[PDB]
Paper text:
The zinc-uptake protein ZnuD is expressed under zinc-limiting conditions and was originally discovered in Neisseria meningitidis, where its expression is under the control of a zinc-sensing transcriptional factor, Zur14. ZnuD is an 82 kDa outer-membrane protein predicted to be a member of the TonB-dependent receptor (TbdR) family, requiring the mechanical energy derived from the TonB/ExbB/ExbD inner-membrane complex to couple nutrient uptake to the proton gradient across the inner-membrane. Characteristic of other TbdR family members, ZnuD consists of an amino-terminal plug domain (residues 1 to 147) obstructing the lumen of its own carboxy-terminal pore-forming domain (residues 148 to 734). Combined with molecular dynamic (MD) simulations, our structural findings suggest that ZnuD acquires free zinc ions using a series of binding sites that move zinc across the outer-membrane through a transient pore that requires TonB activation.
The high affinity of this TbdR for zinc is exemplified by the observation of a zinc ion bound to ZnuD despite no exogenous zinc addition during the purification. Indeed, all three ZnuD intermediate structures presented in this study contain a zinc ion buried in a high-affinity zinc-binding pocket. The metal ion captured within the high-affinity binding site is coordinated by four conserved residues (Asp-99, His-100, Glu-340 and His-499) located in a buried pocket that is sealed by the plug-apical loop and extracellular loop 6. The nature of the endogenous substrate bound to ZnuD in the crystal structures has been further characterized by X-ray absorption spectroscopy to confirm that the bound metal is a zinc ion. The absence of any metallophore within the binding site suggests that ZnuD is able to sequester and translocate free metal ions from the environment; however, it does not exclude any potential metallophore-binding activity as the neisserial TbdR FrpB/FetA has been reported to acquire its metal ligand either freely or presented through a siderophore. In addition, on binding its zinc ions on peripheral sites, the immunogenic loop 3 undergoes major conformational changes resulting in a switch between rigid (β-strand pairs) and flexible (α-helix) conformations. These two dynamic states of the external loop 3 illustrate how this loop adopts various conformations that would ultimately interfere with the surface/sequence availability of this epitope. Interestingly, the most immune-reactive epitopes reported to be targeted by the antibodies from convalescent patient overlaps with the extracellular loop 3, which camouflages the high-affinity zinc-binding pocket.
Residue numbers in the entry: 20 to 241, 248 to 259, 272 to 287, 300 to 433, 457 to 553, 564 to 610, 628 to 734
């Protein structure tokens, strides 16, 4: 029961490790799967994509990690783009805060979400072989989900791994929504495949893996353009482009996406003198997606990623431990239209971004108190020159482990993305024109958080209180007057604070009852007044029940009270306001050749009109009542 993302273990009390067997019974998308963990919401976008929203932050203010590596996707661009991780094929998903975030990115203020996978075995399987098989169906979805993974000892110290998943799902049923049985364009198909090969220790393991993922899914709530769009708008010619928006007023939207991945991992256990561990990670990621209407492409998306990170763990110099590393990340990306680059300027013109990053964490241990500090300094070059310095310092006081009090502080700098300073074009799915800013200054943030945790047979609880102070908070500022939005990229200050927590009391070791909840406030302060921050979540209180009876069978009930959101940003609207009731049960079973984990799930029994203010489809109801039956065969 540990975490893997940091070569050196810095553990704060508000760290959460979700089990992989459990994820097999969860939604396919990352954001839907993590929703329900206190402090984490979702930005759904039909059955296709959903991003986690963590402490009101999302995208570039958090970090999704594909087994310590850059996923290489383009989900940071907009929540309609799927995140390239397979949580249903994952070993574990760890949600981490602290100085560790500095190992992977700059500007990560809310949480690091690392998805660890079986791609490259790291260990020799028993009996020479191991793997699992999974199958499930879901009502009103209409989800079919099959999955498998395999590990084979190709000899004495050699292991091959394969794994894959195929999913088909329809437009989802909606309660009371218009006169519709199902919400149009919310269907989703996905396949993933991996082949791996890895060594064994001592000292460690080395290995490579090839992956392939094709996604095909609709764009819910959704011909003339080649001129007027450009050129051009700085400044006020939105006057002249939504005049011919009602001229053509008076295809079928979907995304076809392909992701190809080549990576290498290695990590052995006593590299040479003075060091306890050495860890490498090489990655190449081919990402593409066409945003289409029928068979025609409206936007071409591309993101080539190459990523390298080397981390070594130094000798404990007398109870102070540390891991220092270097990372190289180059990312070639573009976002084009059917229109040539010879007539119009692309939404995102073809660009070359390079990240040179030096990082590390150091922890000192004075018995029942740990102190870990962290740093990151990355330089960027941007062919078509700044530096981000981020630091974090954190203390943990164990009165009696486990009785945890964490105090964590950090200053993080995020360098602006090329999208943010150079965007200039209609993104169809979002029906928004995007404009960049030639002069943004880095996102600087000063963050403080205190977490408290106890888990002691009778009582179990987890609490966290946080504030995030931005001297600079870069945001997509909606602009001057169901047409098409226009956003400019802007700067101000911001003040985010909130709380999240869960507490469980078990009367017997047999039964467990619990209450959970979260709340977050987001404000824009000091504008070039004092308005709310965009797409902030809503408060949520949770009631939880879970009980085994017995040895194999495990029923469970989850009731969430999602309150409305009336603290809204510049052009936002109110969002109710729903009651989520979820039922669940599980079958544990031991036959020959495998453990057989049957499962049955019932979500949204009250059949409520569910809206999420934190999503781009805030006035679009999400899935009504749905039944799920599934099987897993571990072996
Ligand atoms: C036990 C059920 C497992 C089913 C696994 C499905 C098989 C995995 O599919 C992987 C291939 O997915 C399609 C890849 O296509 C990529 C397109 O690249 C061609 C471009 O020239
Ligand atoms: C820190 C909570 C556990 C009990 C602390 C008392 C023991 C020593 O703590 C004093 C200094 O460290 C406290 C935590 O440090 C936070 C780092 O903030 C640095 C901001 O510049
Ligand atoms: Zn898009």
């Amino acid at each position: 029961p540990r975490a893997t993302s940091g070569l050196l273990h810095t553990s704060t009390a508000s760290d959460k490790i979700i089990s992989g067997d459990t994820l097999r019974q969860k939604a396919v998308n990352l954001g839907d799967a993590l929703d329900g963990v206190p402090g984490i919401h979702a930005s759904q976008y039909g059955g296709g994509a959903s991003a986690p929203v963590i402490r009101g932050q999302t995208g570039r203010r958090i970090k999704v990690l594909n087994h310590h590596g850059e996923t290489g996707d383009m989900a940071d661009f907009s929540p309609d783009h799927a995140i390239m991780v397979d949580t249903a094929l994952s070993q574990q998903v760890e949600i981490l805060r602290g100085p560790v975030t500095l190992l992977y990115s700059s500007g990560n203020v809310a949480g690091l979400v690392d998805v660890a996978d079986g791609k490259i075995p790291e260990k020799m399987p028993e009996n020479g072989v191991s793997g699992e098989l999974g199958l499930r169906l879901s009502s009103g979805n209409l989800e079919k989900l099959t999955s498998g993974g395999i590990n084979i000892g190709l000899g004495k110290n050699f292991v091959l791994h394969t794994e894959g998943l195929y999913r088909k799902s329809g437009d989802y049923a909606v309660p009371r929504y218009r006169n519709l049985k199902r919400l149009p364009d919310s269907h989703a198909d996905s396949q993933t495949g991996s082949i791996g090969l890895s060594w064994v220790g001592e000292k460690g393991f080395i290995g490579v893996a090839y992956s392939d993922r094709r996604d095909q899914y609709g764009l819910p709530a959704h011909d003339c353009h080649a001129d007027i769009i450009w050129q051009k708008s700085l400044t006020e010619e939105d006057i002249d482009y939504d005049n011919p928006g009602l001229s053509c007023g008076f295809g079928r939207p979907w995304i076809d996406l392909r992701n190809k991945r080549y990576e290498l991992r290695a990590e052995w256990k006593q590299p040479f003198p003075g060091f306890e561990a050495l860890r490498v990670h090489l990655n190449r990621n081919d990402y593409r997606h066409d945003e289409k209407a029928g068979d025609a492409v409206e936007n071409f998306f591309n993101n080539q990623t190459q990523n390298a990170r080397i981390e070594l763990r130094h000798q404990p110099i007398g109870r102070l431990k540390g891991s220092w590393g270097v990372q190289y990340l180059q990312q070639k990306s573009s976002a084009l239209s059917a229109i040539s680059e010879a007539v119009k300027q692309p939404m995102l013109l073809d660009n070359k971004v390079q990240h040179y990053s030096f990082f590390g964490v150091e922890q000192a241990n004075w018995d029942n108190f740990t102190l870990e500090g962290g740093v990151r300094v990355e330089k960027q070059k941007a062919s078509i020159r700044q530096t981000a310095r981020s630091f974090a310092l954190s203390g943990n006081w164990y009165f009696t482990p486990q009785h945890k009090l964490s105090l964590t502080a950090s200053h993080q700098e995020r360098l602006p993305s090329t999208q943010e300073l150079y965007a200039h074009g209609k993104h169809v799915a979002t029906n928004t024109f995007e404009v960049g800013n030639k002069h943004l200054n880095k996102e600087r943030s000063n963050n403080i958080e205190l977490a408290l945790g106890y888990e002691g047979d009778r009582w179990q609880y987890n609490l966290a209180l946080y504030r995030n102070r931005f001297g600079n908070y870069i945001y997509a500022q909606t602009l001057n007057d169901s047409e098409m939005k226009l956003v400019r990229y802007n700067q101000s200050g911001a003040d985010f604070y909130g709380a999240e927590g869960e507490i469980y009391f078990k009367p017997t070791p047999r039964y467990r009852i619990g209450v959970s909840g979260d709340y977050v406030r987001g404000r824009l302060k000091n504008l070039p007044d004092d308005q709310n921050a965009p797409r902030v979540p809503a408060a949520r209180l949770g009631f939880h029940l879970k009980a085994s009876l017995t040895d194999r069978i495990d029923a469970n009930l989850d009731y969430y009270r999602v309150f409305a959101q009336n603290k809204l940003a510049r052009y936002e609207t109110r969002t109710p306001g729903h009651h989520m009731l979820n039922l669940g049960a599980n079958y544990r079973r031991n036959t020959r050749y495998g453990e057989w984990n049957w499962y049955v799930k019932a979500d949204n029994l009250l059949n409520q009109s569910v809206y999420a203010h934190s999503s781009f489809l805030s006035d679009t109801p999400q899935m009504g009542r749905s039944f799920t039956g599934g099987v897993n065969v571990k072996f």
